[PDB]
Amino acid sequence: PLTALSPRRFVVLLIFSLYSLVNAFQWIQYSIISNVFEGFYGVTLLHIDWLSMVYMLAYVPLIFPATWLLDTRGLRLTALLGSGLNCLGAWIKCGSVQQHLFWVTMLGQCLCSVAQVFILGLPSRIASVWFGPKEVSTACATAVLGNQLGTAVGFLLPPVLVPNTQNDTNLLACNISTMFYGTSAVATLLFILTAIAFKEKPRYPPSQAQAALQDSPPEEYSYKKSIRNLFKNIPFVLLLITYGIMTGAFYSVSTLLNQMILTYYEGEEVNAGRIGLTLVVAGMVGSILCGLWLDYTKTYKQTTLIVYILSFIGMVIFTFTLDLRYIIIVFVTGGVLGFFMTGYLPLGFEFAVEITYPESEGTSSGLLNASAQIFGILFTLAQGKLTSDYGPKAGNIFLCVWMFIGIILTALIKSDLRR
Ligand SMILES: CC(C)CCC[C@@H](C)[C@H]1CC[C@H]2[C@@H]3CC=C4C[C@@H](OC(=O)CCC(=O)O)CC[C@]4(C)[C@H]3CC[C@]12C
Ligand SMILES: CC(C)CCC[C@@H](C)[C@H]1CC[C@H]2[C@@H]3CC=C4C[C@@H](OC(=O)CCC(=O)O)CC[C@]4(C)[C@H]3CC[C@]12C
Ligand SMILES: CC(C)CCC[C@@H](C)[C@H]1CC[C@H]2[C@@H]3CC=C4C[C@@H](OC(=O)CCC(=O)O)CC[C@]4(C)[C@H]3CC[C@]12C
Ligand SMILES: C[N+](C)(C)CCO
Numbered sequence: 001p002l003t004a005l006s007p008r009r010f011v012v013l014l015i016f017s018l019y020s021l022v023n024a025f026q027w028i029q030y031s032i033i034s035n036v037f038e039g040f041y042g043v044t045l046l047h048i049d050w051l052s053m054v055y056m057l058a059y060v061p062l063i064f065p066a067t068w069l070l071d072t073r074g075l076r077l078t079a080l081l082g083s084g085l086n087c088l089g090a091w092i093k094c095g096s097v098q099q100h101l102f103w104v105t106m107l108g109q110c111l112c113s114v115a116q117v118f119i120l121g122l123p124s125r126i127a128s129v130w131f132g133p134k135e136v137s138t139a140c141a142t143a144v145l146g147n148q149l150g151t152a153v154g155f156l157l158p159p160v161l162v163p164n165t166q167n168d169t170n171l172l173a174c175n176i177s178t179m180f181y182g183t184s185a186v187a188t189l190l191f192i193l194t195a196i197a198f199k200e201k202p203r204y205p206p207s208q209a210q211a212a213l214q215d216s217p218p219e220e221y222s223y224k225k226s227i228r229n230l231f232k233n234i235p236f237v238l239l240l241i242t243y244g245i246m247t248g249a250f251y252s253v254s255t256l257l258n259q260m261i262l263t264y265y266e267g268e269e270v271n272a273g274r275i276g277l278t279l280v281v282a283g284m285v286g287s288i289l290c291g292l293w294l295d296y297t298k299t300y301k302q303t304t305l306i307v308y309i310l311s312f313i314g315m316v317i318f319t320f321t322l323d324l325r326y327i328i329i330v331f332v333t334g335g336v337l338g339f340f341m342t343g344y345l346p347l348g349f350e351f352a353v354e355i356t357y358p359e360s361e362g363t364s365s366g367l368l369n370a371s372a373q374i375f376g377i378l379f380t381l382a383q384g385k386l387t388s389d390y391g392p393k394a395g396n397i398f399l400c401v402w403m404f405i406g407i408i409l410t411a412l413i414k415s416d417l418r419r
Pocket of ligand 1: 047050054058110114
């Protein structure tokens with residue numbers, strides 16, 4: 001069949017990244033300056049942590065229905081839903097700048113959480129539908145890097161945008177309103193652009209494989225049967241548990257980073273955001289390097305196990321070096337830990353995909369993400385309680401123990417797959 005590539009693809013991809021990026025920002029805007037918000041709303045730190053945990057909670061039940069909707073109705077509807085939900089949540093947050101309106105901010109965060117479900121699955125679908133065979137991998141990498149950059153910007157900007165001024169409540173409200181209004185304006189512009197230019201599919205197929213897929217009639221897929229078959233594979237279950245543990249540890253560290261840093265470094269919220277951004281950027285670099293290393297070696301289990309062990313070592317180093325009262329040490333430790341942790345994620349994801357080659361990639365991706373969300377919620381709750389009661393060291397040691405368990409599980413995995 002005739003195959004052509006149009007410039008619109010890039011626009012589409014760009015737009016997606018942007019309205020993915022903002023979403024990631026909204027995930028971590030509250031946590032990085034949680035203490036300040038704790039002062040503004042007169043709530044507990046658990047209230048602020050739930051603003052991060054709602055993203056994880058919403059994904060698990062709605063992912064599979066969201067995947068079914070994406071398959072049945074196409075990419076355009078999913079993109080529109082995600083962008084509109086993000087914009088509406090941003091506006092609701094804009095309407096929540098008051099000491100007695102924490103529930104409005106929670107509603108906005110819930111809307112953004114529902115939006116996230118419609119965004120995480122779009123990268124590969126867009127890359128296939130709009131990009132040629134050579135550019136699929138690069139398009140997907142850019143799409144995911146958009147969300148990761150959004151997380152980094154959420155780590156960095158809010159500390160600067162909203163200085164901690166409990167003495168002056170009006171100034172704090174003004175800064176919070178400014179941040180919310182900026183996010184809302186960006187989200188609204190991105191939603192308008194998605195509506196205007198986010199077409200369902202290109203005029204001509206981008207590749208022969210996509211041409212065959214579009215030409216081929218749709219086929220019914222049993223998500224429940226696929227999940228049951230996937231759970232039958234013990235190696236897949238072990239890899240799911242390990243990936244969930246790693247991603248949940250990352251989420252817990254991100255959510256509670258401000259609480260950990262403020263314990264020993266008071267008045268360093270900006271430095272905490274810088275540490276988070278360094279962690280995320282080192283994670284991006286480590287992900288790229290690990291992808292290249294896996295491509296060159298063609299080894300999955302060995303590379304994944306080495307990366308897991310290095311992540312555990314970095315976690316231990318960060319755990320037992322936070323109290324030295326040297327901010328630069330925290331910077332370096334967080335950079336190394338993010339490098340290794342984020343490098344693990346693509347390796348484990350690709351290992352899961354190849355282990356379950358007969359099964360659909362979408363179902364395995366949904367299972368991996370749901371395990372990540374569940375482990376993130378559990379780790380966030382446990383580590384927050386440990387930090388509140390016994391101090392950050394207890395929660396960090398808890399994370400290290402879970403990482404050791406994950407290392408054991410990864411070692412136990414049996415796989416002859418090579419690639
Ligand atoms: C629509 C989808 C995205 C699901 C929406 C679920 C949320 C609205 C729920 C899930 C868990 C809930 C939280 C579960 C536990 C708590 C702790 C709870 O704390 C207390 O009551 C004690 C506070 C104190 O120690 O003084 C306050 C409500 C809160 C944050 C809840 C707020 C509402 C949450 C975030
Ligand atoms: C990683 C470990 C720690 C937790 C693994 C939990 C999963 C087995 C859960 C998480 C989300 C669940 C799904 C959430 C929603 C649905 C939709 C639900 O839809 C229906 O009720 C109709 C199904 C049909 O059309 O037959 C079917 C079960 C399913 C796929 C659930 C199956 C079980 C899942 C995959
Ligand atoms: C796989 C799952 C089921 C493992 C769960 C293990 C947890 C129950 C462990 C992991 C980290 C442990 C904590 C690590 C460090 C400490 C500090 C320790 O502090 C003290 O009061 C004694 C030492 C001191 O004086 O500092 C008290 C126990 C506690 C909270 C530990 C309690 C038990 C925890 C939470
Ligand atoms: C996937 N994110 C990191 C964007 C949110 C986790 O709840």
